[PDB]
Amino acid sequence: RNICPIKGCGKNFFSHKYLVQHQRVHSDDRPLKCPWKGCKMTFKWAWSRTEHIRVHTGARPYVCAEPDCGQTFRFVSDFSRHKRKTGHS
DNA sequence: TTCTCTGTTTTG
DNA sequence: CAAAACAGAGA
Ligand SMILES: [Mg+2]
Ligand SMILES: [Zn+2]
Ligand SMILES: [Zn+2]
Ligand SMILES: [Zn+2]
């Protein structure tokens, strides 16, 4: 059990290493930056930054493999929701 | 609806 | 292992 000390947080984590990284939730630094030209967005989590760049490019890399489905997604959560909903993969 | 945040899982 | 990615929730 690795429990967060702070405030009215106190949730526990599968791991101690993640408990340490979790602390960025209760700090205000947003050290990751958007590499797009003159976008001022900043982040704490690298995955947010990765998905975010697709708003700039328009990409839709998540492609449903179900025969004849044909659907594509910009964001992994959406792709997971659709599999969940539908049963594809 | 689009998208970001984050705890856990997968990949390398 | 650490980094990348997922899956879920929900702003
Ligand atoms: Mg920039
Ligand atoms: Zn906490
Ligand atoms: Zn940006
Ligand atoms: Zn599908």
Numbering used by the authors: 1265 to 1353
What's in the article?
The RELATIVE OF EARLY FLOWERING 6 protein (REF6/JMJ12), a Jumonji C (JmjC) domain—containing histone demethylase, specifically demethylates H3K27me3 at its target loci. REF6 has intrinsic DNA-binding ability and specifically recognizes its target sequence (CTCTGYTY motif, Y = T or C) via tandem zinc-finger (ZnF) domains located at its C-terminus. Structural analysis demonstrates that CHG methylation is unfavorable for REF6 binding and attenuates REF6-binding affinity.
Although the overall structures of the REF6 ZnF domains were similar between complexes with methylated or unmethylated DNA oligos, there are minor conformational changes when DNA strands carrying the methyl-group.
